[model samples]
Target: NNALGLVETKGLVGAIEAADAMVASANVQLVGYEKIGSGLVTVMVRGDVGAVKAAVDAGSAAASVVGEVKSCHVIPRPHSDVEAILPKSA
Candidate 1:
């Protein structure tokens, strides 16, 4: 699931703080983050379905509390080619 969250803060500091909180509150593990702009960060999360969902929600909520977030998106899981190369169960 691909999730898009938009956050607008009072300033750069506020944005950074909100981003930090979002990541901390997320239920999933942090895979990485993409810097979209000076005050924008796109977070990548990996975990179980429940965890992913919770993280997205938590991330958005964290940003919203101190700022404004818009258009949250959650993309579906991508297929793994490695699975095909691996041997079947024992």
Candidate 2:
């Protein structure tokens, strides 16, 4: 899934709630998320234009409301490190 990520938030519960809000508003499929590091969260979602937009919006809104969230980011899709784990196909 193409993701908007690195949505920085503090505290475990706040991050989880933000993730939940994003999933709920997603018009398409909520593929869930990966909780990485201490204060960062990335949400994974898939769908057409509308779904993706809605999901991102929801995440932003949720994060803004959180007392622990100083800021939130919508990042572009990241490359998989697994692809580099092995030798290239060249």
Candidate 3:
């Protein structure tokens, strides 16, 4: 339950595309998203390491097709303190 995947894109549509693809590609769940101005958005997902990795990969590829994928990553087991502060869905 500690694995975390993140995909950052250039626009809202791209973020949505990444999120949808990620969830559809694996067992991960949409955790939340962040908007950092300048039209940058980051979508987050949670699951096992393998699932998270798969989700991130699919998310980046899918997003890149429609939007600019800025970055992507998978944290196998994040620190508790970091997780405590990470954003969550409303």
Candidate 4:
């Protein structure tokens, strides 16, 4: 996986649907998810450039149709230094 996809949503339901849509729409793996202090959610995924971009886009759209979507982002060929900030999977 060389890219990271993020779909930040306004609620849990939105985040869940986005994550579902992400994996369904592209060849991406679900990394994990985190909840902000404001109750916002960030659904993360890892994949190739095309996968991450398309995954995030589809996820962003799916979430909006269900509940509320905040923002969507993709990181292509992200650095390990940057990955340090992301939570690790068990």
Question: Which runs of model 4 end up more than 4 angstroms from their true locations?
Answer: none
List residue ranges in candidate 1 displaced over 4 A: 1-27, 79-90
lDDT of candidate 3 at residue 77, scale 0 to 100: 92
Give the Cα lDDT of each candidate.
Answer: 0.51, 0.56, 0.91, 0.90
Q: Write the per-residue lDDT of candidate 1 for residues 1-63, one digit (tens) a residue.
A: 333232344344445554566467655555545445645555555556655666666766676
**Which candidate wins on TM-score?**
3
Query: What is the C-alpha local distance difference test score of candidate 1?
Result: 0.51
In model 2, the Cα lDDT at residue 33 comes to 51
Candidate 2: segments with Cα more than 4 A from true spot: 1-8, 67-90
Ranking by TM-score: 3, 4, 2, 1
Q: After superposition, which runs of candidate 3 have C-alpha atoms over 4 Å from their true positions?
A: none
Model 3 Cα lDDT, one tens digit per residue, 21-49: 99999999898799989999999999999
**Per-model tally of clashing residue pairs:** 10, 1, 0, 0
Q: What does the lDDT read for residue 72 in candidate 1?
A: 50
Comparing 3 with 4 on TM-score, the higher-scoring candidate is 3
Please give the distance, in angstroms, between residue 62's alpha carbon in candidate 2 and its true position after superposition: 1.0
> Candidate 1, residue 8: CA error in Å?
9.7
Q: Per-residue lDDT for 1-90 in model 2, tens only?
A: 354333346666666676677678765454545455776655445556565667667776786676366455443444676334322211
Q: Using TM-score as the measure, name the better of candidate 2 and candidate 3.
A: 3
Clashing pairs in 4: none
